[PDB]
Design a protein around this ligand. Structure first.
Ligand SMILES: [Mg+2]
Ligand SMILES: [Mg+2]
Ligand SMILES: [Mg+2]
Ligand SMILES: [Mg+2]
Ligand SMILES: [Mg+2]
Ligand SMILES: [Mg+2]
Ligand SMILES: [Mg+2]
Ligand SMILES: [Mg+2]
Ligand SMILES: [Mg+2]
Ligand SMILES: [Mg+2]
Ligand SMILES: [Mg+2]
Ligand SMILES: [Mg+2]
Ligand SMILES: [Mg+2]
Ligand SMILES: [Mg+2]
Ligand SMILES: [Mg+2]
Ligand SMILES: [Mg+2]
Ligand SMILES: [Mg+2]
Ligand SMILES: [Mg+2]
Ligand SMILES: [Mg+2]
Ligand SMILES: [Mg+2]
Ligand SMILES: [Mg+2]
Ligand SMILES: [Mg+2]
Ligand SMILES: [Mg+2]
Ligand SMILES: [Mg+2]
Lengths: 129, 156, 205, 82, 80, 123
RNA sequence: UUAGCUAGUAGGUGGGGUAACGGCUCACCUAGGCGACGAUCCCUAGCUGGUCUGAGAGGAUGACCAGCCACACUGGAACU
RNA sequence: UACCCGCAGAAGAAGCACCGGCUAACUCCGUGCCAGCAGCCGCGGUAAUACGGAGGGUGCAAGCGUUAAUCGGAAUUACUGGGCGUAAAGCGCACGCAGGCGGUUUGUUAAGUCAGAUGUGAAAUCCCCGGGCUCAACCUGGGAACUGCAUCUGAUACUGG
């Protein structure tokens, strides 16, 4: 069954990049929106857009640099079978700081670097590199 | 100039009607003391001919590696066919902590400070391919900055 | 607990000069410095990576005259201390008292400097020090004591120290037969043929 | 009874005494309640060879702790130096 | 302010005594998975006022019996 | 491999048996020679390996190879085994210590003398 | 390749008892209680701070020093 | 007693393992599938760098080796960090209780989670910066650490209710 939408989101991104797809659509959510907000801000996708009213469809415009893909690697960390929570000291550095770790905190979803500057940790959603 | 190291020689065979025909293989790696590295695999009836064919192919098919000062930039992994390979940037003067063929390829790569580990099969051909693939797909802060469309300082 | 055999056999094995003799007579006169010792000395076999790491570590040991357990403990200390391990390892070898005596030229060899230490001829900051491996902190004075100040071999060693290059990190006064360990030396002050990374890779299996 | 006393924690021929608060039925180097300082009899010049938390010592004495003969000597020597 | 716990009532057959399943929610020390762990306690109740499947809130007191050192404070979700 | 499966049934290790069980985690055991004899080895080799059947102190009766050239071993001789198997012999898992309690050192051996219990030959 | 165990057993009332709560004990009443989150049975074993190893997580271990427990020919008992 | 001073004179003071590959280090003479070596691969049948001696050399050094034992290497029980078409490995298939997991929205809770504070986590030990024995070992001051637990105060994205 569809037990996990966030890994479905990441997988549709990953396969879109490998297929050289321009845009990727999926059923929207409040969290999938907050993550695409982060991925646009950090520069991995160009733009996101949610359309529709009763069942909204989130469309992501992917980003390609020099022909090849921007998102080299994207991985799910916390899963329904195994949740991962970290403190602010034990936040990870993806690719020695080059990649990011999308973290859900009490003050919303942010990157790991802003979580450290905020002085608070949370749930590690994904490693994006 | 381009420092050249042979990693391993090996005697192979080929059975015919008369009997066994022996031959020699040579695995060489070249490098400029910087990110320009390249390997070769030659084979002949004789060992100096095999090293010469290997150095010939290695001097071409070089690959460029975005180094840091003397080390890597982020912990990278490389696979080829039997050999998952982990390597990690290290502090100054900790040395090349690496196994077998990876020491030679990083020495001619001009790296000097790594913490490496070769899991799986340690066949030198595949592990040197796995290191070449790991260093080749290791990316700089400039390349990720131009890619994400931000500055290096916005990447930190 | 010391090597007491032939010294040029060691320099012949390492292939280069180790300054194990005073340098009055030329080493190419005293020995075949280009030929390894023994019956099978002429042959130069294809030396392995473990061979070059061993020969480099045995070079540095045979230079300074340090046995293996103690050289291992210097590696442990250099890895514990911050910064470059090989540079701290050489700074610890250069901090030995018998090296400071050699570098000040009070003894012709490091062994003769060792013998002066063991034979109570050295005062450190006024206090007599009998130990070859005493570490010499910066801003420390080191002197010949009164009775052995009139030795012949001391001012002969100062002559040969004048033939040798003067080290920067020291400040010697050859009249008083004293000196001053001003600071720990930089890597650039030392020799460049020593590949300290081979030792780190050796003790980092 | 509860007492305040030394505890030999040194090398051979070179003692060093932790001044501790202990129930007197325990061993010398054994169980204690609170370590209120030290004393070094082979103390060089330009080092402390005596350091006593006199506020805690007067706290335990207000609780009724006894004082050894050497501890009371070291309290005298502290209250004469200072 | 006093420390208290909650849980379902497992059994109520013995008089002035009920058995309560407190279900704590702990992490595994190795694999990181969060595992529900169940704790059964014999709880003193006056008046035999609780039933099966009932949620209850208990506090720790002096030992009433051999296996019983807990007394409820109040009852939530009384009915079936 | 599922973490739930590992919760319910953990990763069990391999209890490694000892190839010298008669020593009982001791380095050497005193034994008494029951029968001294020779044995032909496996097929690629060909020799007469000198080996003794020993009643030990702990009660076991094991066979033990006798190294070196020549031995004064008899029955009712008191030896000291040390562990270490001979590959080219089936069932021999132990080596006798040459130079211990009845066994003599090797006659006129001047290299590896400590592995055979031989004093330093004075000049 | 140990799945069922338990009748002072589980709880209640009252009496006794201890420095003190309490089946601790006794009478009576009730019929419970534990157990697949491993009861019971079997083998082994003093526990910890820690030590060794290991990049780490982990693995092994518990000599010396220090904290707790237990025992003092064996099995029991009480006195002060 | 440490410690110091004086005397005399190189006197009174170096061995052990190894040298086929792994593994740093080679030649000769005996020897002949014998004697024997051996951690593994394997050596030995008349030219043995692999046995035994010698010369030479290498590694350690008042120690050197062997044996036993633990971890490591071993990602070879894999949490980190493995696999299951043919190499070991998908139950013959299915329903299904317990159990594990769970679409989307709003509100609430605050259990999990996160942050902070307080108490505790004995000392020693490990680590850092120092101090003292001629140095070191050792001894020692201070600190960090003991990744834990409890309570309280908050936070509410996520998970749960
Ligand atoms: Mg393999
Ligand atoms: Mg020594
Ligand atoms: Mg260091
Ligand atoms: Mg009563
Ligand atoms: Mg009663
Ligand atoms: Mg026992
Ligand atoms: Mg490991
Ligand atoms: Mg008794
Ligand atoms: Mg070699
Ligand atoms: Mg021959
Ligand atoms: Mg050999
Ligand atoms: Mg293992
Ligand atoms: Mg393992
Ligand atoms: Mg496998
Ligand atoms: Mg088959
Ligand atoms: Mg099969
Ligand atoms: Mg099937
Ligand atoms: Mg949900
Ligand atoms: Mg909470
Ligand atoms: Mg908290
Ligand atoms: Mg502590
Ligand atoms: Mg000091
Ligand atoms: Mg909710
Ligand atoms: Mg909620």
């Amino acid at each position: 069954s569809m037990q996990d939408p966030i890994a479905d989101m990441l997988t549709r991104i990953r396969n879109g990049q490998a297929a050289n797809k321009a845009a990727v659509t999926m059923p929207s959510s409040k969290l999938k929106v907050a993550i695409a907000n982060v991925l646009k801000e950090e520069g991995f996708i160009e733009d996101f857009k949610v359309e529709g009213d009763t069942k909204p469809e989130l469309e992501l415009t992917l980003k390609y640099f020099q022909g090849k893909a921007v998102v080299e690697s994207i991985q799910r960390v916390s899963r329904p079978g195994l949740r991962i929570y970290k403190r602010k000291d034990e936040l990870p550095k993806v690719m020695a700081g080059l990649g990011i770790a999308v973290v859900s905190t009490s003050k919303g979803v942010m990157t790991d670097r802003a979580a450290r500057q905020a002085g608070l940790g949370g749930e590690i959603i994904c490693y994006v590199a | 100039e381009l420092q050249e190291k042979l990693i391993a020689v090996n005697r192979v065979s080929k059975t015919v009607k008369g009997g066994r025909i022996f031959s020699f293989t040579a695995l060489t790696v070249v490098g400029d003391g910087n990110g320009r590295v390249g390997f070769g695999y030659g084979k002949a009836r004789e060992v100096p001919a095999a090293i010469q064919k290997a150095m010939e192919k290695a001097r071409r098919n070089m690959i460029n590696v975005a180094l840091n000062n003397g080390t890597l930039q982020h912990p990278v992994k490389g696979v080829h066919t039997g050999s998952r390979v982990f390597m990690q940037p290290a502090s100054e003067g900790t040395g090349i902590i690496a196994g077998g063929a990876m020491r030679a390829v990083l020495e001619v790569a001009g790296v000097h400070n790594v913490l490496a580990k070769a899991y799986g099969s340690t066949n030198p051909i595949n592990v040197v391919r796995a290191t070449i693939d790991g260093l080749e797909n290791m990316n700089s802060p400039e390349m990720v900055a131009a890619k994400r469309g931000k500055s290096v300082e916005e990447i930190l | 607990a010391r090597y007491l055999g032939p010294k040029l056999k060691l320099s012949r094995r390492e292939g280069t000069d180790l300054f194990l003799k005073s340098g009055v007579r030329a080493i190419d006169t005293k020995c075949k410095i280009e030929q390894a010792p023994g019956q099978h000395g002429a042959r130069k076999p294809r030396l392995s990576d473990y061979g070059v790491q061993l020969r480099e570590k045995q070079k540095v040991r045979r230079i300074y005259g340090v046995l293996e357990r103690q050289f291992r403990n210097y590696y442990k200390e250099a890895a514990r201390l911050k910064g470059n391990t090989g540079e701290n390892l050489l700074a610890l070898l250069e901090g030995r008292l018998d090296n400071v005596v050699y570098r000040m030229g009070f003894g012709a060899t490091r062994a003769e400097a060792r013998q002066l230490v063991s034979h109570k001829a050295i005062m450190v900051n006024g206090r007599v020090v009998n130990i070859a491996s005493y570490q010499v902190s910066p801003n420390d004075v080191v002197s010949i004591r009164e009775k052995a100040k009139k030795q012949s071999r001391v001012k002969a060693a100062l002559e040969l120290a004048e033939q040798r290059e003067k080290p920067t990190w020291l400040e010697v006064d050859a009249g008083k037969m004293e000196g001053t360990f001003k600071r720990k030396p930089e890597r650039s002050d030392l020799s460049a043929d020593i590949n300290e990374h081979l030792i780190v890779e050796l003790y980092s299996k | 009874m509860v007492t305040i006393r030394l505890a030999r924690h040194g090398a051979k021929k070179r003692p060093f005494y932790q001044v501790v608060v202990a129930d007197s039925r325990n061993a010398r180097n054994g169980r204690f309640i609170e370590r209120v300082g030290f004393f070094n009899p082979i103390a060089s010049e330009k080092e402390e060879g005596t350091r006593l938390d006199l506020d805690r010592i007067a706290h335990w004495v207000g609780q009724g702790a006894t004082i050894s003969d050497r501890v009371a000597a070291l309290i005298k020597e502290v209250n004469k130096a200072a | 302010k006093i420390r208290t716990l909650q849980g379902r009532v497992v059994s109520d057959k013995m008089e002035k005594s009920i058995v309560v399943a407190i279900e704590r929610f702990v992490k595994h020390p190795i694999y990181g998975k969060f595992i529900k762990r169940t704790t059964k306690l014999h709880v003193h109740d006056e008046n035999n006022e609780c039933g099966i499947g009932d949620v209850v809130e208990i506090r720790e007191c002096r030992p009433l019996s051999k296996t019983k050192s807990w007394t409820l404070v109040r009852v939530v979700e009384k009915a079936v | 491999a599922t973490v739930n499966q590992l919760v319910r049934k953990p990763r069990a290790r391999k209890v490694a048996k000892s190839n010298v069980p008669a020593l009982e985690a001791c380095p050497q055991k005193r034994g008494v020679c029951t029968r001294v004899y020779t044995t032909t080895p496996k097929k690629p080799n060909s020799a007469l390996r000198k080996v003794c059947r020993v009643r030990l102190t702990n009660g076991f009766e094991v066979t033990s190879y006798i190294g070196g050239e020549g031995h004064n071993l008899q029955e009712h001789s008191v030896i000291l085994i040390r562990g270490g198997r001979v590959k080219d012999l089936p069932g021999v898992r132990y080596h006798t210590v040459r130079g211990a309690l009845d066994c003599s050192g090797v006659k006129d051996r001047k290299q590896a003398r400590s592995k055979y219990g031989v004093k330093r030959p004075k000049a």
